[PDB]
Amino acid sequence: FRPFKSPLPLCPFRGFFPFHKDNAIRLGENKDVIVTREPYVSCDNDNCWSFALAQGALLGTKHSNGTIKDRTPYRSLIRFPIGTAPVLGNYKEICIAWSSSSCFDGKEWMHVCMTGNDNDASAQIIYGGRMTDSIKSWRKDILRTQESECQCIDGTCVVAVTDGPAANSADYRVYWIREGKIIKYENVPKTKIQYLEECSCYVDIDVYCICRDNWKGSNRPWMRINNETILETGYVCSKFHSDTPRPADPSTMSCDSPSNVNGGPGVKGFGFKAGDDVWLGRTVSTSGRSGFEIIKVTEGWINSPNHVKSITQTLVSNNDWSGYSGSFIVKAKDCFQPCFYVELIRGRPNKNDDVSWTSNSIVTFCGLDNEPGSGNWPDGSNIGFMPK
Amino acid sequence: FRPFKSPLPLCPFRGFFPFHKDNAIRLGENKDVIVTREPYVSCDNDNCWSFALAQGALLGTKHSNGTIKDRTPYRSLIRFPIGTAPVLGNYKEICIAWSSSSCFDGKEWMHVCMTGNDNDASAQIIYGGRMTDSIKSWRKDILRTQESECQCIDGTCVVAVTDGPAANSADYRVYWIREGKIIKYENVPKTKIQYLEECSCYVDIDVYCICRDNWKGSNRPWMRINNETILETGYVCSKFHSDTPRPADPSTMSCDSPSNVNGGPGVKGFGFKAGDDVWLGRTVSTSGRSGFEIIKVTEGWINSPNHVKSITQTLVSNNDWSGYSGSFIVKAKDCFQPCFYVELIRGRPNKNDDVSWTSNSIVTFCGLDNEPGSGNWPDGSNIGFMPK
Amino acid sequence: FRPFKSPLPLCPFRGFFPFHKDNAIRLGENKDVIVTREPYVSCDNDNCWSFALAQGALLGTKHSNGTIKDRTPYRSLIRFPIGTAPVLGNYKEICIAWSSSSCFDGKEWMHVCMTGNDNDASAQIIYGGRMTDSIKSWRKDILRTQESECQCIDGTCVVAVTDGPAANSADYRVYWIREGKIIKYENVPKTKIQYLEECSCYVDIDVYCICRDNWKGSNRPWMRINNETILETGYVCSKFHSDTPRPADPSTMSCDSPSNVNGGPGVKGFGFKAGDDVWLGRTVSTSGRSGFEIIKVTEGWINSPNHVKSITQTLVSNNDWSGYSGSFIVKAKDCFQPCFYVELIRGRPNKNDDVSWTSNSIVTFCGLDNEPGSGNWPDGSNIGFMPK
Amino acid sequence: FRPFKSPLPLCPFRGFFPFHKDNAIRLGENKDVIVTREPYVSCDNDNCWSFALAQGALLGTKHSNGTIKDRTPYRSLIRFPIGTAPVLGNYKEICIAWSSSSCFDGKEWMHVCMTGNDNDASAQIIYGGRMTDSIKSWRKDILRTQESECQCIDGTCVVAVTDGPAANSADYRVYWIREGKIIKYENVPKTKIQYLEECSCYVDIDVYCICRDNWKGSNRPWMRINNETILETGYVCSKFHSDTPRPADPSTMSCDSPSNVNGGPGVKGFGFKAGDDVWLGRTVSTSGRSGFEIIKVTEGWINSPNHVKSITQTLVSNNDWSGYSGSFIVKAKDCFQPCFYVELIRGRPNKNDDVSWTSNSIVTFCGLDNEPGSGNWPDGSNIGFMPK
């Protein structure tokens, strides 16, 4: 017997530390590795796992040509041991998906898997390996979800879902799902948030989600959610913005609205509220998906004149390609430890990655209440060595 | 301790949804994948699994040349994680077989494995990994079985077996097997059914099997069976036929006899009785093994003037190759969920598949009481990229 | 908790049936498969396993050239799922060995592993993964053992071991080992047996071993052993001999001495006593390692004028290569089922196998009290397709 | 429930015996095997495991070129089944590391993983898969650790760590870690030891560590440690030295100070105290990393005029390449069995290994209270067959 996961507080932390790294592109030089993108990490009672949307092809084969394409019937959510490259001999196929979320509720895994036509997609809910429920596209425009782990509290899992156009008004919802059965949903209030997608969520008593506004906000939209309802919404107050593209530091403090500058197209990212402060992941570049750093902004969670970047950890240099990033948690004793992954995209459309495919490797970091050192942990592939 | 599976009713459902897809041919471009055909799916308490008849060769190697051939000593029933491509690093070999069935009784797996000479084949019964019993060919003409999962009720498993010619009178039996020991068999009554093979079965209180008449019936033969005996037999009443080849819709309503038109050679397929209605899988083409759709026919299970196709889901376009299809079930709480797989055959003798081998990938769908979206989930291989 | 295996009788049987087949050479065409020889099978509570002496090289690579060689430091006993080809992604390395035996005592696995110099080899005893004891070569001439499964009764395992020359007088012993600790050994009486090696053993209340005389006996030497001592010895009385080479049928009935004809070099083989009768495996050829058949000889276990071959099953045609064969058992309820494997050697020095390496595949059969069909289950490799 | 490992005495032993060997370089000829170095072995309740620092590349691929380099962001501690070659289909990635230690406390695994910049590295402590603590470089000069298994007593694990220059005064510490949390550390006393790194440790009631002085000592520094503190320190008294390089036998008896001759650069090695005697591993060559032998020196642990090499086992000939070696233990009933591994380095900078990469295979031996035979168990690769 295992109990459902509880509403634990986030553990104390003062810096982030290198955890697992798969080096998947380097290891894929001889065409062993499955083409992926939109990876993430999620853990059960016994293991943390890598997840990613595979492309139904091996890296460097003819079928990998053109895998920049976002949605195909040949994409599946796959799972593989954390920090290992995904290969045919180690992967598990979770469901057919070109958008996904996964989370463990203390007893079983839940997955949310979108596939099908852009104008008529459906999300399949998997629980304990069984398809238990589904969501039918209601705006008929690329029904989609987090691309990182959802969160579960006392047996009820919470997941953010979007249907509708990019860079215009769309529908944003949270779904509450228990043992694979949809209990209810809520349309996210639009009093503050104007656009939300690709939420990166964690638990600190309640579920916090920090997401991607691909329309008018260079600042990130966020929600606080419990097992019953959405409790609060906003944009991250920090005058230092964390989407990509975005304005140079310092920019506007916008707690209640999109920054109305450099709003599109954005990238999936994450942050962690800490007291009145906030930690924010972001690309080093303000324009492109290169580099990765994480900053701590004093009073960055609140309306304040005192925002300052107290800490900056540079984890992937600006000379290296990054991509999506997302939060995951690991249960410590009586608190949840904040961790995150960074997708390191290689191939199209990256400048000078002269290959026909698009894929990624993974690197991960976890938070400790200790002072970190410094380093650089990029993809590390010599793109010239690779099968094109 | 685990109890034997019970005689549960089928769960309510109103459409089918994409589950797992292996993309095995695409992933086999670099010769990692085992050549297979006649795949199916079956689940135990903890996992669903892919099964298939391997050909003792890797796809695209010289030994894969000529694998259109149905029966060789080098064919084995293999098992691999559901939705994964079968590779040497992930497969398990269950038994030597060129025809098979597998099912889990709640405690252990049973398999039925035919191999040997066409005129002197034997079926090996495996239970919990041990060879426990066997069936000796009695008509001496390709003793053979379902090529999809059998069914077990309160510890007694039921499996359909045929011995004798194709497109002429043969012998059809059901065998009852408990803990791997043959309890009894029955010759299927020929009052209605004139030919039966390759049964696709599921549980809805009793076992229902919908099978393949390769002789005079474009409609599918069926049986209702319990833990002791065959209870009913017939052909599916639906005036919309579901074998391949078959007449164009609408055709004859034949509840009690073969349609006596477009009877051969047929293809393995499946259906689900639902009240007085019936769901039927079928190729899109009325002549060839291309496309896959599933229809719901109002009152299609009974003798009625009111048959109509209330629903048609097109899951694989007619421009794509299909093949065999079969039912499997997944235990929900107090009901069994209806699912099915579709074999996507590539290679010989398919027109324009210019390779020397014959193999397949898999796609699967499960039934939910929700409205589906729409999509297309074909093999997806560019046959031109493949090692011939 | 699991009890130690008990002294069960052999189950009734009247023929042998195809079980698992790995097709390892066919599947090794693309250099994925580990080079092996001297395979065997042994089972624990939950699985049967393939074992073999690997050669520390992949089939078809430059390091596989010359693997006809019997003993090197690069040979390890490896284990892989039964009926699968041994590959880097599925194998386990048990110990360094160029001669081995393995058996499961009901709780844990024991292995006996010989390696080192011909004139100073030692056998390592492994129990539950730990090296627990050892045997030092005492005749200083290729200390060696069964190359098939040993047997364990009420926690005491029995294994036959030889040290000394081939085709001359050597030392033969049985060792009793409990939880990996050597309890005692006995020098095999030489009142009847003149040479013994490579014993194939099973349990029928007591342990029976049928072995290889590589000196003067075309008939096979045998022993009956319990948890304490050797109880009986002899040669198989059957006037139909079962070593290779051997005289044509019928030959001499020699219950108490080597036949004194066609004695060398012999091949590992097996048999099963059944009442006063005996089942004997043997190559089809009387001179070479080609084909495989199993015969039942009426009264073949005893001194009698009534020996006759009541049954002959031809399992591998004489046009196909065979090799070693050995017994293993599978617990049925209150009896042990007799099974056997056949090593199918390909490569050097086989005539017309034009490659530089030597390896093998595996096929297995189990006994049932049912009438068998007929078939042929050879290696199946087109040696011309293989990397040399 | 499993108890924490106890302070057991070392088991009696009088020689070492071949255990597991992976033949990883031979098996890597077709580019399947992960490039590694600094391997070791450590066991839990159910299995012994191989560990090594991978290089984020497959052997023989372009990314393997230049892997002589010691520290990169693409190095991870990986785990794979003992005696198997590390491949993508069997490995687990434990953490990002270019220096590591691992040990099992009876309940869970702990790992210590150093990565990042040379002048600002940090060690991540992993316990039960979760990052639980860390050590920040304090001398800012390649914070580093054992490269073999740590040891745990009654739930408290002990690990030796160094920060500072090579061939000059550095800082050496022991850390005590419980359930992944650092309890305390101690600076190693410098009353006797002048330099310590790469400790090879085992348990004999207390923890004994025999390490590498890379400065002034051709004799090896050692410590005796319990769950609370460092109890004793010294250099191995044996007038026969065991670092590499070192003086020819016999050299100085230096129980309390470095030999002050042939002190650098040294190699990781191990030994076992036995009564007043000591067993010492060492390369056969006194100058290079070739060959491997283990000696027993009578009274070699103490100050005595009676040191003599009572036993010499030559396990890898001087014509073969060796490398690092380290101790590990296996629980026997009420004692710990002493075992060790030897890293067999191939590639740069080894003379005549004409390839661009640097990697290794593994061989292992365990101690028994029996007389051994003799043999030779080198890497066995024909470097000429390998992809460069």
Ligand SMILES: *[C@@H]1O[C@H](CO[C@@H]2O[C@@H](C)[C@@H](O)[C@@H](O)[C@@H]2O)[C@@H](O[C@@H]2O[C@H](CO)[C@@H](O)[C@H](O)[C@H]2NC(C)=O)[C@H](O)[C@H]1NC(C)=O
């Ligand atoms: C949602 O969970 C609560 C229990 O969790 C607490 O309340 C949540 C709203 C949130 O604030 C958490 O952080 C809190 O820890 C459930 O409330 C329980 O309901 C049962 C049955 O009525 C009752 O016996 C308990 O006393 C309640 N527990 C508490 C602490 O109030 C609530 O039922 C959950 N809602 C759903 C829809 O599952």
Ligand SMILES: *[C@@H]1O[C@H](CO[C@@H]2O[C@@H](C)[C@@H](O)[C@@H](O)[C@@H]2O)[C@@H](O[C@@H]2O[C@H](CO)[C@@H](O)[C@H](O)[C@H]2NC(C)=O)[C@H](O)[C@H]1NC(C)=O
């Ligand atoms: C990646 O693929 C492109 C496109 O390939 C073509 O279209 C595909 C859908 C498929 O049908 C292929 O068979 C086609 O070749 C390649 O670009 C083509 O290259 C060919 C051969 O040099 C050239 O004749 C065409 O004009 C190109 N077509 C286009 C639209 O650019 C490209 O070479 C592939 N990249 C790699 C690294 O192989």
Ligand SMILES: *[C@@H]1O[C@H](CO[C@@H]2O[C@@H](C)[C@@H](O)[C@@H](O)[C@@H]2O)[C@@H](O[C@@H]2O[C@H](CO)[C@@H](O)[C@H](O)[C@H]2NC(C)=O)[C@H](O)[C@H]1NC(C)=O
């Ligand atoms: C077959 O199973 C029945 C129990 O299942 C019920 O009866 C079947 C025929 C079928 O209609 C199912 O859907 C039903 O749920 C067994 O009947 C039991 O037998 C035992 C022993 O005699 C008796 O104690 C119980 O009362 C019976 N149970 C019921 C509900 O009647 C029957 O034994 C099974 N037959 C075989 C050969 O195994």
Ligand SMILES: *[C@@H]1O[C@H](CO[C@@H]2O[C@@H](C)[C@@H](O)[C@@H](O)[C@@H]2O)[C@@H](O[C@@H]2O[C@H](CO)[C@@H](O)[C@H](O)[C@H]2NC(C)=O)[C@H](O)[C@H]1NC(C)=O
């Ligand atoms: C697939 O195999 C066929 C047949 O191969 C021949 O017969 C086999 C049983 C085996 O013995 C092979 O060695 C033989 O080559 C191939 O067709 C043959 O191709 C060869 C060479 O071009 C030609 O000389 C023969 O006439 C052909 N034989 C026949 C009966 O057609 C075919 O090329 C193979 N396909 C692929 C993609 O390689």
Ligand SMILES: *[C@@H]1O[C@H](CO[C@@H]2O[C@@H](C)[C@@H](O)[C@@H](O)[C@@H]2O)[C@@H](O[C@@H]2O[C@H](CO)[C@@H](O)[C@H](O)[C@H]2NC(C)=O)[C@H](O)[C@H]1NC(C)=O
């Ligand atoms: C060997 O096993 C016997 C028990 O097995 C029986 O005797 C064997 C010799 C063999 O004939 C088997 O087939 C039989 O089933 C052990 O005898 C037991 O010893 C214990 C302790 O003295 C005693 O309490 C039991 O009564 C004995 N059991 C019987 C049936 O006699 C014997 O100890 C074993 N010897 C060793 C060395 O382990």
Ligand SMILES: *[C@@H]1O[C@H](CO[C@@H]2O[C@@H](C)[C@@H](O)[C@@H](O)[C@@H]2O)[C@@H](O[C@@H]2O[C@H](CO)[C@@H](O)[C@H](O)[C@H]2NC(C)=O)[C@H](O)[C@H]1NC(C)=O
């Ligand atoms: C299998 O190997 C033999 C022998 O290889 C030679 O000796 C080995 C130990 C090793 O040192 C190799 O590098 C040597 O090549 C091969 O036979 C040799 O082939 C070469 C090249 O054609 C020839 O010059 C030598 O005379 C041969 N030596 C002998 C003793 O025959 C043989 O070709 C290999 N087989 C295959 C299929 O590659």
Ligand SMILES: *[C@@H]1O[C@H](CO[C@@H]2O[C@@H](C)[C@@H](O)[C@@H](O)[C@@H]2O)[C@@H](O[C@@H]2O[C@H](CO)[C@@H](O)[C@H](O)[C@H]2NC(C)=O)[C@H](O)[C@H]1NC(C)=O
């Ligand atoms: C360290 O372990 C001891 C128990 O182990 C013994 O003492 C060690 C110092 C070492 O000498 C071992 O080989 C010995 O076996 C712990 O001592 C126990 O402490 C508890 C709580 O105070 C007490 O109830 C027991 O009586 C003590 N046991 C003994 C045998 O003295 C000690 O607590 C451990 N220290 C730490 C920091 O964990």
Ligand SMILES: *[C@@H]1O[C@H](CO[C@@H]2O[C@@H](C)[C@@H](O)[C@@H](O)[C@@H]2O)[C@@H](O[C@@H]2O[C@H](CO)[C@@H](O)[C@H](O)[C@H]2NC(C)=O)[C@H](O)[C@H]1NC(C)=O
């Ligand atoms: C191993 O690599 C070296 C170096 O490769 C060069 O530098 C690397 C960092 C990378 O940028 C590569 O693309 C470069 O080629 C190889 O040595 C080079 O070989 C090339 C081609 O022959 C030659 O023109 C350069 O002068 C060489 N550079 C140096 C510094 O020596 C070497 O060939 C590789 N080894 C193998 C076995 O391939």
Ligand SMILES: CC(=O)N[C@H]1[C@H]([C@H](O)[C@H](O)CO)OC(C(=O)O)=C[C@@H]1NC(=N)N
């Ligand atoms: C469902 C879907 O296709 N989501 C997209 C996504 C999307 O286009 C934008 O967020 C706008 O809505 O962006 C990104 C892109 O890297 O920005 C990759 C995704 N790829 C996949 N999830 N497959």
Ligand SMILES: CC(=O)N[C@H]1[C@H]([C@H](O)[C@H](O)CO)OC(C(=O)O)=C[C@@H]1NC(=N)N
């Ligand atoms: C035992 C056997 O060989 N069964 C056949 C089968 C058969 O020929 C017909 O159903 C007529 O009886 O049809 C099909 C074919 O795709 O229609 C493939 C099978 N291949 C295998 N099961 N191996």
Ligand SMILES: CC(=O)N[C@H]1[C@H]([C@H](O)[C@H](O)CO)OC(C(=O)O)=C[C@@H]1NC(=N)N
């Ligand atoms: C230890 C050893 O090398 N045993 C031999 C063996 C042996 O030479 C004879 O039985 C004579 O004693 O025969 C055979 C051979 O196939 O006949 C293969 C073996 N190969 C291995 N077991 N590695």
Ligand SMILES: CC(=O)N[C@H]1[C@H]([C@H](O)[C@H](O)CO)OC(C(=O)O)=C[C@@H]1NC(=N)N
């Ligand atoms: C952390 C680190 O880089 N340690 C080194 C090491 C080191 O340079 C010396 O011991 C001197 O301090 O020596 C050796 C070398 O083989 O002697 C390999 C190591 N490689 C790795 N552990 N990655």
Ligand SMILES: [Ca+2]
């Ligand atoms: Ca934005």
Ligand SMILES: [Ca+2]
């Ligand atoms: Ca038909």
Ligand SMILES: [Ca+2]
């Ligand atoms: Ca003989």
Ligand SMILES: [Ca+2]
């Ligand atoms: Ca491969």
